[PDB]
Design a protein around this nucleic acid. Structure first.
Length: 72
DNA sequence: TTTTTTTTTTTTTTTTTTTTTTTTTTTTTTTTTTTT
């Protein structure tokens, strides 16, 4: 959509819910340490250069997931 | 009978033998439990 120059505002609701295809194919709790993070990092690397050229918005939506082992 | 005298011209190719080198990471995820 963004590369087409047609649409100008794009919304991705709850980026946390876009599971990888590999994780879907595999069983529950197999592993997939950070695969979501790798996917998200690779996505931006490819679309940042097209978003500026197409003058679009890609407002992403996120969730609050409390972390462990943090005191202060 | 006596009695020798002088060279002239090039034609043709034939066959390949041998490898030499790696190069770079990429990414987090999720809390549990009141005690007197």
């Amino acid at each position: 959509l963004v590369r087409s120059n047609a649409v100008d505002v794009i919304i991705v609701d709850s980026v946390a819910a876009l599971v990888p295809k590999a994780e879907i194919e595999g069983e529950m709790g197999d592993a997939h340490v950070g695969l979501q993070a790798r996917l998200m990092s690779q996505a931006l690397r490819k679309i940042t250069g097209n978003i500026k050229n197409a003058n679009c918005l890609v407002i992403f939506i996120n969730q609050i997931r409390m972390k462990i082992g943090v005191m202060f």
